[PDB]
Design an enzyme around this catalytic site. Structure first.
Site, PDB file in Angstrom:
ATOM      1  N   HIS A  45     -11.622  -6.873   9.459  1.00 18.99           N
ATOM      2  CA  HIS A  45     -12.212  -6.567   8.231  1.00 18.99           C
ATOM      3  C   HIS A  45     -10.855  -6.410   6.890  1.00 18.99           C
ATOM      4  CE1 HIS A  45     -11.258  -2.237   8.474  1.00 18.99           C
ATOM      5  NE2 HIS A  45     -11.241  -1.954   7.497  1.00 18.99           N
ATOM      6  N   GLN A  64      10.134   1.040  -2.962  1.00 17.90           N
ATOM      7  CA  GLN A  64      11.651   1.179  -3.133  1.00 17.90           C
ATOM      8  C   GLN A  64      12.395   0.197  -2.310  1.00 17.90           C
ATOM      9  OE1 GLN A  64      12.219   5.758  -4.041  1.00 17.90           O
ATOM     10  NE2 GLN A  64      14.069   4.668  -2.786  1.00 17.90           N
ATOM     11  N   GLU A  69      13.710  -4.192   5.152  1.00 20.65           N
ATOM     12  CA  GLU A  69      12.635  -5.206   4.997  1.00 20.65           C
ATOM     13  C   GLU A  69      12.746  -6.361   5.334  1.00 20.65           C
ATOM     14  OE1 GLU A  69      13.729  -3.067   2.632  1.00 20.65           O
ATOM     15  OE2 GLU A  69      12.410  -2.087   1.272  1.00 20.65           O
ATOM     16  N   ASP A  93     -13.560  -5.315  15.746  1.00 18.16           N
ATOM     17  CA  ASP A  93     -12.829  -5.000  14.658  1.00 18.16           C
ATOM     18  C   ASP A  93     -11.406  -5.462  14.964  1.00 18.16           C
ATOM     19  OD1 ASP A  93     -12.895  -2.803  11.576  1.00 18.16           O
ATOM     20  OD2 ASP A  93     -12.322  -5.043  11.929  1.00 18.16           O
ATOM     21  N   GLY A 186      -6.650   2.069   3.620  1.00 20.91           N
ATOM     22  CA  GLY A 186      -5.569   1.739   3.712  1.00 20.91           C
ATOM     23  C   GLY A 186      -4.631   1.982   4.977  1.00 20.91           C
ATOM     24  N   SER A 188      -6.655   1.206   7.782  1.00 16.43           N
ATOM     25  CA  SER A 188      -7.198   0.247   8.627  1.00 16.43           C
ATOM     26  C   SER A 188      -6.407  -1.011   9.301  1.00 16.43           C
ATOM     27  CB  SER A 188      -8.249  -0.453   7.722  1.00 16.43           C
ATOM     28  OG  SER A 188      -9.091   0.389   7.632  1.00 16.43           O
ATOM     29  N   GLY A 189      -6.537  -1.180  10.370  1.00 15.23           N
ATOM     30  CA  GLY A 189      -5.589  -1.905  11.155  1.00 15.23           C
ATOM     31  C   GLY A 189      -4.315  -1.931  11.847  1.00 15.23           C
TER      32      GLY A 189
HETATM   33 CA   LIG Z   1      10.599  -0.657   0.843  1.00 14.24          CA
END
Ligand SMILES: [Ca+2]
Length: 240
Positions: A45, A64, A69, A93, A186, A188-189
Site C-alpha cells: 500500500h 540532516q 546516506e 500487503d 509513516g 508502514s512497509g
Molecule cells: Ca540524513
C-alpha cells in the site's frame, strides 16, 4: 513509532526510507527493508500511487547530512498479485522494489535476514519496531530513527473479539497493543525485527493500525508475516 526512543546509528542497518518526489522536494512516506544489494521489501500500500520513488539507505536523521546516506532510484515495482487496495485486511500487503543501482554494503548498510518459510513466533516474543513515522496519533514524523520494544501477540489472541477479531488473518503478525507503544503512519512497509536463535530477523512488514488511533490498548500493530511469503520473494528475485 509512538512511545519509542532514538535508535543508535548502526543499530538497524537494513532499515530504509521510502521517499517520493513532492514538487522539487522528496518526502519520506514509508519504511522498507534491504534484502539484496538491489532489492527492497516494503508494503504494497506504500506504492499504490503512481509517484516517483527513491530509496535512502544508511539514513538516520531525515533532515540532516549524516555522512552515511546512499540515494538510489526505483527501477521496477512488484506488488503481490493478490494485493487489493480496497481490502488491506485481506492481507497480501507486500511489495518488492528493484533498485536502479546496487547499494554498497558497510556498517551503516546491511542486508536484512529473513526467517525460514512457515516460521511462527511464540506469544510474547521479543521484537522491536523501527521507523520514522508519527510519534503521536495525528502527530508528526520523527526526524531521527525511532525504535520501540513491541512483543508479539499470537493469532489465537489477536484474532479474538477483544483484540482485532476477524480483521486479522494468519498471514499477519500482531505485536504490541499495550496502549503506549505502537507503529503509526509513516512506519508502514518497515521491519519488525525479532530475536530468534540469537539473531534479529525480519518477521513483519508494518501494515496497519486502528482507525481509532495508533497506540490503542488491545489493538496491536498489524504486520504482514514475512514467513508466509518466502517462496514468493525468492521466485521474484530469481526471475527479475
Ligand atoms: Ca540524513
Amino acid at each position: 513509532v509512538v512511545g519509542g526512543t532514538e535508535a543508535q546509528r548502526n543499530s538497524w542497518p537494513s532499515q530504509i526510507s521510502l521517499q517520493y518526489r513532492s514538487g522539487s522536494s522528496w518526502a519520506h512516506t514509508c519504511g522498507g527493508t534491504l534484502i539484496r544489494q538491489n532489492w527492497v521489501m516494503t508494503a504494497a500500500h506504500c506504492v499504490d500511487r503512481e509517484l516517483t520513488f527513491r530509496v535512502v539507505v544508511g539514513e538516520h536523521n531525515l533532515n540532516q547530512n549524516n555522512g552515511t546516506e546512499q540515494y538510489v532510484g526505483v527501477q521496477k515495482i512488484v506488488v503481490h498479485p493478490y494485493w487489493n487496495t480496497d481490502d488491506v485486511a485481506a492481507g497480501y500487503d507486500i511489495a518488492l522494489l528493484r533498485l536502479a543501482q546496487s547499494v554498497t554494503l558497510n556498517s551503516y548498510v546491511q542486508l536484512g535476514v529473513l526467517p525460514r518459510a512457515g516460521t511462527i513466533l511464540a506469544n510474547n516474543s521479543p521484537c522491536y519496531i523501527t521507523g520514522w513515522g508519527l510519534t503521536r496519533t495525528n502527530g508528526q514524523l520523527a526526524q531521527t530513527l525511532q525504535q520501540a520494544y513491541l512483543p508479539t501477540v499470537d493469532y489465537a489472541i489477536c484474532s479474538s473479539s477483544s483484540y482485532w477479531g476477524s480483521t486479522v488473518k494468519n498471514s499477519m503478525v500482531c505485536a504490541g497493543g499495550d496502549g503506549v507503544r505502537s507503529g503509526c503512519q509513516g512506519d508502514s512497509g518497515g521491519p519488525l525485527h525479532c530475536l530468534v536463535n540469537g539473531q534479529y530477523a525480519v518477521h513483519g512488514v508494518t501494515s496497519f493500525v486502528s482507525r481509532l488511533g495508533c497506540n490503542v490498548t488491545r489493538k496491536p500493530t498489524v504486520f504482514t508475516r514475512v514467513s508466509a511469503y518466502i517462496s514468493w520473494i525468492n521466485n521474484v528475485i530469481a526471475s527479475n
